[PDB]
Design a protein around this ligand. Structure first.
Ligand code: NA
Ligand SMILES: [Zn+2]
Lengths: 269, 9
């Protein structure tokens, strides 16, 4: 069931849409130079993101998981939103002044949509720049470089790099009085439940959508991979913007190849 | 539709 590659046709749908949902994934961050540690060429040491972003990995080797997230936090300091992020933010602003809604549902944890100025933003998997205490549950913003002294200079990505093996007491710890708990990234890991309040907001946006754009996602991680297919199955137009086809491509009305930073400025003008 | 994050097989 081959989707259309006609931008002119897509633009006629775009012109009429009053409730656009944009779902974004790791490819949009990759176009800003962010290492995603997914796909055929994405590895930190000898692992991919889905090997380390798990409760079991964190239970068995919290130092290694923290090294991985520390590396990613520090690299992000030098990364900026790309033309795709900017086109999405500019579109939201322009349509909002016309009484038309754009909402971004991002799988990404990098805060690049936020940095680009997107306002209607659902970060469905949390953030690299938030911590949660495993003892008291408090969630906090954390941009500190480095997040703790023991991690300074650690997290190097080359294969064969030795574990830092930081004692748990010297990994990031809660600073609330009397707690002292071990912090973790406030990131939804593989095997964990997404936040119910966020899923309810997603459900409402999808149910009312009249055009859905699926941008830079491989459509292999659930639940997010089912969002756009659910809309399409009700007849709602979906346009996939991706450098490759995915398992979901043939469910959608349009497929546009190339970097999202090249195609979205045209599509959303 | 599951609220559990899963790298689909
Ligand atoms: Na993705
Ligand atoms: Zn605490």
């Amino acid at each position: 069931a081959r989707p259309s590659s006609s931008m002119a046709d897509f633009r006629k749908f775009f012109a009429k849409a009053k409730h656009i949902v944009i779902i974004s994934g790791a490819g949009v961050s990759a176009e800003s130079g962010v290492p995603t540690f997914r796909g055929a060429g994405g590895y930190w040491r000898k692992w991919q993101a889905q090997d380390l972003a798990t409760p079991l990995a964190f239970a068995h080797n919290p130092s290694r998981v923290w090294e991985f997230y520390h590396y990613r936090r520090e690299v992000m300091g030098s990364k900026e939103p790309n033309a795709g992020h900017r086109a999405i933010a500019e579109c939201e602003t322009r349509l909002g002044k016309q009484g038309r809604r754009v909402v971004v549902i991002t799988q990404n944890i990098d805060e690049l949509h936020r940095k680009a100025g997107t306002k209607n933003l659902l970060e469905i998997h949390g953030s690299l720049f938030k911590t949660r205490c495993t003892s008291c549950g408090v969630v906090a913003e954390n941009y500190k470089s480095p997040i703790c002294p023991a991690l300074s200079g650690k997290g190097a990505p080359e294969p064969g790099t030795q574990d830092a093996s930081i004692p748990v007491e010297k990994l990031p710890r809660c600073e609330e009085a009397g707690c002292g708990g071990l912090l973790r990234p406030h990131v939804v890991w593989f095997g964990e439940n997404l936040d119910p309040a966020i899923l309810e907001e997603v459900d409402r946006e999808l149910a009312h959508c009249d055009l859905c754009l699926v941008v830079g996602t491989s459509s292999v991680v659930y639940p997010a991979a089912m969002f756009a297919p659910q809309v399409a199955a009700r007849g709602v137009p979906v346009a996939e913007f991706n450098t490759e086809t995915t398992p979901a491509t043939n469910r959608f009305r349009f497929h546009f190849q190339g970097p999202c930073g090249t195609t979205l400025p045209e599509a959303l003008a | 539709x599951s609220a559990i994050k899963s790298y689909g097989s």
